[PDB]
Symmetry: C3
Subunit: 191 residues, 3 copies
């Protein structure tokens, strides 16, 4: 029994907000914090029996990010001080719920069904605008462990992934997180 | 095709949270941060085909704000230091999604269909209480640009507004934001 | 008229976020902020006529908390500086909407219908994992005042509770909030 995805969508929370860098303008003043909203608009369905969102490893998912750039950024304020801004990246990856320090790579498919690692994508964020970034045809590179039901009940050792969607500033060969959300837990099934 | 508004309502995020002032009590101690929840409870309907909330410029909308005042505020901590608190204002305005520095004025109508600019309203926030503030009969002063469909598809240049709902402290002829939320994108149609 | 609880659930916001302590690791470095999600998954139903969630005092409710511990915590950074960490507690309590400084005790029932005060529960938070904590068979110790309808309309003096769900660190005989959410307003009826 699956809930209507027009009404039931993955919920997100800020991820590692105390570690984010911040953007500064040409006058060396911190900009008002950019607006940031993430939506996983394809590929996930809430399973009532599992009490969790489910996706199928081979059916692609899609994430849309709305990034509202307030002001005109010129610098990133890092732990090592201000640095000139080179570019922005959007980065997506999974983490294991039971081992949050272990990442699950994300792959992107093409029509010919070839798949490539999904590396961070360059995003241009013009000033005073929301930029909408849609990342489609995505797949987790692994299934979650212990998916099989036991006694018509969820596996007691059911494992999960959480999806991390992060906006990064690149400065002097280093990337710095500006904003990041992490999803609620997700089950990834093979068949 | 429109989603049920009892289940699908405008989502909000904190707006410019790094620029907010904070409230202090009579003993010069920062209060626990007030609770703040915004609900656009009339006038918006999610259009599946447009993948966005829609409203009609001439049908009024309504916003309800729940402000939970913890403690008894006496001062606002501004960038220029502590200042005695005079009053609180609730301020509502739109911004253009493609030009976030451009505001859309909000107007308020009466039964006789006259309309007036909606300026910030004085709100009394007694200590240790949630104050519910309902602002009704509202209208955007403009339609969004490029509303007309092209080939039975959304206009590729469809423009949007976002609604900003902010609680301000007034001190020494100056207003300071204490809490503010901004909505997801909204289409505003004429007919 | 009640909304489907598979689609309409209690919304939460961070509570007193400027007063939280933070966790540090063995190398005296602040950990990335833990992930924290609260769900009131049984006992609450949104009443359209009251424009609020309702529960029955004698039907128990249940809250599930997902706590994602990033890194390995060893110290709590308090206002009085770093202190070694002893244990973690999950604390739940109500507050009166019209008197936020007044708490509503929560009680927990057993099958034999005996009820005990629900005091904070010890939670073990192993590193690099989400710990799921489910707290069931709960009851508010009071009904909300002024529940009875007047003229087929909500009582104009209808009172409400808000639920607070807080993760605390215990250090040197003192508890420190690490993360806390507060619910939207709730009506608690007797019959």
């Amino acid at each position: 029994s699956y809930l209507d995805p027009n009404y039931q969508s993955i919920k997100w929370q800020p991820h590692q907000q105390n570690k984010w860098a911040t953007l500064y303008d040409a006058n060396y003043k911190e900009l008002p914090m950019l607006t940031y909203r993430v939506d996983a608009d394809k590929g996930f369905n809430f399973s009532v029996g599992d009490d969790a969102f489910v996706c199928q490893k081979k059916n692609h998912f899609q994430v849309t990010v709305y990034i509202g750039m307030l002001g005109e950024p010129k610098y990133v304020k890092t732990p090592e001080g201000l640095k000139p801004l080179d570019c922005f990246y959007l980065k997506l990856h999974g983490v294991k719920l039971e081992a949050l320090n272990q990442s699950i790579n994300i792959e992107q498919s093409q029509s010919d069904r070839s798949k490539r690692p999904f590396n961070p994508v360059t995003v241009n964020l013009p000033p005073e605008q929301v930029t909408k970034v849609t990342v489609g045809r995505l797949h987790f590179s692994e299934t979650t462990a212990n998916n099989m039901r036991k006694k018509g009940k969820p596996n007691p050792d059911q494992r999960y992934f959480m999806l991390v969607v992060a906006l990064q500033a690149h400065a002097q060969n280093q990337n710095y997180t500006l904003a990041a959300q992490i999803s609620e837990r997700i089950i990834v099934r093979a068949s």
